[PDB]
Design an enzyme around this catalytic site. Structure first.
Site, PDB file in Angstrom:
ATOM      1  N   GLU A  60       0.866  -1.183   0.000  1.00 60.89           N
ATOM      2  CA  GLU A  60       0.000   0.000   0.000  1.00 60.89           C
ATOM      3  C   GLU A  60       0.913   1.248   0.000  1.00 60.89           C
ATOM      4  O   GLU A  60       0.734   2.211  -0.765  1.00 60.89           O
ATOM      5  CB  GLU A  60      -0.836  -0.011   1.208  1.00 60.89           C
ATOM      6  N   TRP A  82      -8.343  -1.818  -0.836  1.00 60.98           N
ATOM      7  CA  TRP A  82      -9.070  -0.731  -1.483  1.00 60.98           C
ATOM      8  C   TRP A  82     -10.083  -1.136  -2.492  1.00 60.98           C
ATOM      9  O   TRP A  82     -10.690  -0.295  -3.134  1.00 60.98           O
ATOM     10  CB  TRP A  82      -8.111   0.156  -2.152  1.00 60.98           C
ATOM     11  N   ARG A 218      -7.455  12.868  11.119  1.00 63.86           N
ATOM     12  CA  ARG A 218      -8.701  13.423  11.624  1.00 63.86           C
ATOM     13  C   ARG A 218      -9.654  12.458  12.319  1.00 63.86           C
ATOM     14  O   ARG A 218     -10.333  12.838  13.284  1.00 63.86           O
ATOM     15  CB  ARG A 218      -9.470  14.081  10.546  1.00 63.86           C
ATOM     16  N   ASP A 221      -9.414   4.530  13.523  1.00 64.49           N
ATOM     17  CA  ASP A 221     -10.104   3.355  14.066  1.00 64.49           C
ATOM     18  C   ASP A 221      -9.210   2.777  15.138  1.00 64.49           C
ATOM     19  O   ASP A 221      -8.405   1.936  14.775  1.00 64.49           O
ATOM     20  CB  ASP A 221     -10.279   2.356  12.986  1.00 64.49           C
TER      21      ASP A 221
HETATM   22  N1  LIG Z   1     -15.193  -0.374   1.787  1.00 68.51           N
HETATM   23  C1  LIG Z   1     -14.156   0.150   2.686  1.00 68.51           C
HETATM   24  N2  LIG Z   1     -14.369  -0.230   3.805  1.00 68.51           N
HETATM   25  C2  LIG Z   1     -13.327  -0.036   4.657  1.00 68.51           C
HETATM   26  O1  LIG Z   1     -13.217  -0.630   5.911  1.00 68.51           O
HETATM   27  C3  LIG Z   1     -12.301   0.791   4.221  1.00 68.51           C
HETATM   28  C4  LIG Z   1     -12.179   1.114   2.882  1.00 68.51           C
HETATM   29  N3  LIG Z   1     -13.224   0.884   2.090  1.00 68.51           N
HETATM   30  N4  LIG Z   1     -11.296   2.116   2.601  1.00 68.51           N
HETATM   31  C5  LIG Z   1     -10.095   2.190   3.204  1.00 68.51           C
HETATM   32  C6  LIG Z   1     -10.230   1.903   4.677  1.00 68.51           C
HETATM   33  C7  LIG Z   1      -9.400   0.725   5.126  1.00 68.51           C
HETATM   34  N5  LIG Z   1     -10.164   0.038   6.180  1.00 68.51           N
HETATM   35  C8  LIG Z   1     -10.026  -1.354   6.551  1.00 68.51           C
HETATM   36  C9  LIG Z   1     -10.658  -1.722   7.735  1.00 68.51           C
HETATM   37  C10 LIG Z   1     -10.164  -2.869   8.359  1.00 68.51           C
HETATM   38  C11 LIG Z   1      -9.260  -3.763   7.730  1.00 68.51           C
HETATM   39  C12 LIG Z   1      -8.758  -4.872   8.548  1.00 68.51           C
HETATM   40  O2  LIG Z   1      -9.428  -5.245   9.519  1.00 68.51           O
HETATM   41  N6  LIG Z   1      -7.564  -5.474   8.312  1.00 68.51           N
HETATM   42  C13 LIG Z   1      -7.333  -6.878   8.692  1.00 68.51           C
HETATM   43  C14 LIG Z   1      -7.634  -7.776   7.566  1.00 68.51           C
HETATM   44  C15 LIG Z   1      -9.009  -8.423   7.746  1.00 68.51           C
HETATM   45  C16 LIG Z   1      -9.943  -8.504   6.504  1.00 68.51           C
HETATM   46  O3  LIG Z   1      -9.977  -7.556   5.693  1.00 68.51           O
HETATM   47  O4  LIG Z   1     -10.789  -9.424   6.454  1.00 68.51           O
HETATM   48  C17 LIG Z   1      -6.116  -7.301   9.585  1.00 68.51           C
HETATM   49  O5  LIG Z   1      -6.337  -7.588  10.781  1.00 68.51           O
HETATM   50  O6  LIG Z   1      -5.026  -7.596   9.052  1.00 68.51           O
HETATM   51  C18 LIG Z   1      -8.855  -3.494   6.396  1.00 68.51           C
HETATM   52  C19 LIG Z   1      -9.204  -2.248   5.832  1.00 68.51           C
HETATM   53  N7  LIG Z   1     -11.688   1.703   4.985  1.00 68.51           N
HETATM   54  C20 LIG Z   1     -12.406   2.747   5.793  1.00 68.51           C
HETATM   55  O7  LIG Z   1     -13.511   3.455   5.169  1.00 68.51           O
HETATM   56  O1  LIG Z   2      -6.894   2.203   7.664  1.00 66.21           O
HETATM   57  C1  LIG Z   2      -7.924   2.726   8.136  1.00 66.21           C
HETATM   58  N1  LIG Z   2      -7.898   4.093   8.450  1.00 66.21           N
HETATM   59  C2  LIG Z   2      -9.024   4.829   8.867  1.00 66.21           C
HETATM   60  O2  LIG Z   2      -8.865   6.035   9.026  1.00 66.21           O
HETATM   61  N2  LIG Z   2     -10.278   4.150   9.061  1.00 66.21           N
HETATM   62  C3  LIG Z   2     -11.522   4.761   9.551  1.00 66.21           C
HETATM   63  C4  LIG Z   2     -11.749   5.310  10.855  1.00 66.21           C
HETATM   64  C5  LIG Z   2     -13.204   5.611  10.828  1.00 66.21           C
HETATM   65  O3  LIG Z   2     -13.952   4.497  11.392  1.00 66.21           O
HETATM   66  C6  LIG Z   2     -13.480   5.686   9.283  1.00 66.21           C
HETATM   67  C7  LIG Z   2     -13.579   7.027   8.614  1.00 66.21           C
HETATM   68  O4  LIG Z   2     -14.830   7.715   9.003  1.00 66.21           O
HETATM   69  P1  LIG Z   2     -15.172   9.253   8.428  1.00 66.21           P
HETATM   70  O5  LIG Z   2     -15.398   9.061   6.949  1.00 66.21           O
HETATM   71  O6  LIG Z   2     -16.431   9.841   9.108  1.00 66.21           O
HETATM   72  O7  LIG Z   2     -13.852   9.865   8.859  1.00 66.21           O
HETATM   73  O8  LIG Z   2     -12.501   4.726   8.655  1.00 66.21           O
HETATM   74  C8  LIG Z   2     -10.415   2.815   8.791  1.00 66.21           C
HETATM   75  C9  LIG Z   2      -9.262   2.070   8.382  1.00 66.21           C
HETATM   76  F1  LIG Z   2      -9.290   0.757   8.381  1.00 66.21           F
END
Ligand SMILES: Nc1nc(=O)c2c([nH]1)N=C[C@H](CNc1ccc(C(=O)N[C@@H](CCC(=O)O)C(=O)O)cc1)N2CO
Ligand SMILES: O=c1[nH]c(=O)n(C2C[C@H](O)[C@@H](COP(=O)(O)O)O2)cc1F
Ligand SMILES: Nc1nc(=O)c2c([nH]1)N=C[C@H](CNc1ccc(C(=O)N[C@@H](CCC(=O)O)C(=O)O)cc1)N2CO
Ligand SMILES: O=c1[nH]c(=O)n(C2C[C@H](O)[C@@H](COP(=O)(O)O)O2)cc1F
Lengths: 315, 315
Positions: A60, A82, A218, A221
């Site tokens: 990434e 993504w 800003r 998670d």
């Molecule tokens: N559709 C979408 N949903 C999202 O959660 C997400 C997205 N787009 N755009 C970028 C970020 C990234 N968010 C993420 C949230 C959690 C994990 C995660 O839990 N990582 C795991 C892998 C588990 C899996 O994916 O099943 C780890 O523990 O390694 C990956 C990306 N984000 C926010 O809007």
């Molecule tokens: O890599 C990551 N980084 C991140 O910033 N979020 C978050 C935090 C929050 O739950 C959301 C963004 O919410 P908003 O669009 O209101 O900022 O995604 C999730 C991921 F997995």
């Protein structure tokens, strides 16, 4: 120990954490305003209290670093973080007919037995953006994502700004400046945007020959999102430190809304009963110094030995 | 006491403070990465350990708030903080003939007996931008300064973004968003700029009916510059809190290079042997709620009783 600013963050979201309503509303314990500090000279900041995949971190970050916006490098690197944005906009208009994902993520999160359609339809889509060039070109180019913020900011009279490449000139030209900032916050684009950048702003800083980097995020998670975020910008801080021939100082992580979703509550406590082990270390290719022309295998992690991973629902 | 995050900041620049080279190079003790927190519900954050003029705070902030860029409101409000930029660009090209300020600030800082030319020539210039409309229009409009960042961001296809006014919609429309940011960091404009904004970014936040605001300041002047900076954005946080009918929470001040010039060293110690007195309080007009249509006398400070002021060289 090194990742202890973090564990403490989660302890504090729990202890002083206010209960919030929120956009993804499952619910959230949130604090407002929080700074953490990591000395990178005592080790690479990835979590030993749970298996974090450093492999998704690297691919990434080098996508970003090449100024790429196409979901194909990432898939082609086994990296799927993504997909749902480009797939969200493949479900777009024309072309797409059959089955029917009429806001999908949250739906296979209040799950059907249908999840296999969602994923046999996603495996159709990930195949097409890496076999079809045409496909990939229109349904894989996310647009504004971090690679085109850092490296190609659009200007009001036609051009593009590589702001990353110009700051890297600025650290080599003038170590001691207070204007060394890269921003992904672009005013006009933010009320349209899908995700307005969570990692708003960063500032590098030199002192005494070692660079620090400070990050403004800003929204954060705490459980699923922050551990990863900690390692992207601290790998970026050793990478840039490598290119200007500079040592490594600290990664400073400033936050704005730091938040624990409440369905991660039970998981965050588990890892908080774990004991951190020694930090991992980072090895970079010592020949290759243009980090923009880095690939995967140039970045290396030595002796990362984690506790087991804590899968917990959110995506 | 309330302004004690600050006093501590100065103590820490002195104690862990690294010695820097710098742009204004007199020299500087600097730290990198620093967050402070002020509860505004326990009082308005202006310094009781030295007479800070709250009157220059208000007029500079309402200039910004009207979206103004002309040095005339400010002069017309007895407020001279920004004169040297517009005067720097009156010494520009045409028109200007006689005497000759061929980089001036630093020169009457390695002073001549000439300072009176500089200031009898400045009093010529401040008179003209408030008698002559033509003058004022071309030599008083600073251009990009904070009022045109907050309130009129220029877009790549012709328009302007009032981003402040739209976030104030956003707190009224959706208290609980994590995207509530205003940024003065504009990529294309920053390598041209005179001063690239020291106060880069801010994020408001609601919780439980009270708003907080967080500030990212890339460079800070600890002695002369930070005390004032603390009161501008904390008056802005009570103002915006007033318009959305919301209470007041905390002002969080995140910093990047916080720095003590060394010629202020002796002065910073003096005020550090002073004892803070109780905080001042703020009274706003309770009828008038459109803060953009606020003037001077609507903002009021009750019982501010400072220690004497500590004049010390820098401008
Ligand atoms: N559709 C979408 N949903 C999202 O959660 C997400 C997205 N787009 N755009 C970028 C970020 C990234 N968010 C993420 C949230 C959690 C994990 C995660 O839990 N990582 C795991 C892998 C588990 C899996 O994916 O099943 C780890 O523990 O390694 C990956 C990306 N984000 C926010 O809007
Ligand atoms: O890599 C990551 N980084 C991140 O910033 N979020 C978050 C935090 C929050 O739950 C959301 C963004 O919410 P908003 O669009 O209101 O900022 O995604 C999730 C991921 F997995
Ligand atoms: N030419 C210029 N020089 C600057 O110092 C300056 C400027 N432009 N642009 C905006 C900021 C503001 N910086 C300032 C620095 C100090 C004081 C100050 O010391 N305040 C005094 C009043 C004393 C006086 O001005 O004589 C106080 O104690 O109340 C004012 C403005 N700044 C940075 O590039
Ligand atoms: O109100 C003020 N705010 C501020 O940010 N500075 C500073 C701090 C630093 O000394 C300089 C900006 O330096 P640079 O252009 O390298 O950030 O002006 C000065 C003031 F008086």
């Amino acid at each position: 120990m090194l990742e202890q600013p973090y564990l403490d963050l989660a302890k504090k979201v729990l202890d002083e954490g206010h209960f919030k309503p929120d956009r993804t509303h499952t619910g959230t314990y949130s604090i407002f305003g929080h700074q953490m500090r990591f000395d990178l000279s005592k080790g690479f900041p990835l979590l030993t209290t749970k298996k974090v995949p450093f492999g998704l971190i690297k691919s990434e970050l080098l996508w970003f670093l090449h100024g790429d916006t196409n979901i194909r490098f990432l898939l082609q690197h086994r990296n799927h973080i993504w997909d749902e944005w480009a797939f969200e906009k493949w479900v777009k208009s024309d072309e797409y007919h059959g089955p029917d994902m009429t806001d999908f993520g949250h739906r296979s999160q209040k799950d059907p037995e249908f999840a296999a359609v969602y994923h046999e339809e996603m495996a159709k889509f990930d195949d097409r953006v890496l076999h079809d060039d045409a496909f990939a070109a229109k349904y894989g180019d996310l647009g504004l994502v971090y690679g085109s913020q850092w490296r190609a900011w659009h200007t009001s009279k036609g051009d593009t700004i590589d702001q990353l490449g110009d700051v890297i000139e600025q650290i080599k030209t003038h170590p001691y400046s207070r204007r060394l900032i890269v921003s992904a916050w672009n005013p006009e684009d933010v009320p349209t945007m899908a995700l307005p950048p969570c990692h708003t702003l960063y500032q590098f800083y030199v002192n005494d020959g070692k660079l620090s980097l400070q990050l403004y995020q800003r929204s954060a998670d705490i459980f699923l999102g922050v551990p990863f975020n900690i390692a992207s910008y601290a790998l970026l801080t050793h990478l840039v430190a490598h290119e200007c021939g500079l040592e490594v100082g600290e990664f400073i992580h400033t936050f704005g809304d730091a938040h624990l979703y409440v369905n991660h509550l039970d998981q965050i406590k588990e890892q908080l009963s774990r004991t951190p082990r020694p930090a991992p270390t980072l090895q970079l290719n010592p020949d290759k110094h243009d980090i923009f022309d880095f690939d995967m295998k140039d970045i290396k992690l030595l002796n990362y030995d984690p506790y087991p991973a804590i899968k917990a629902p959110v995506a």
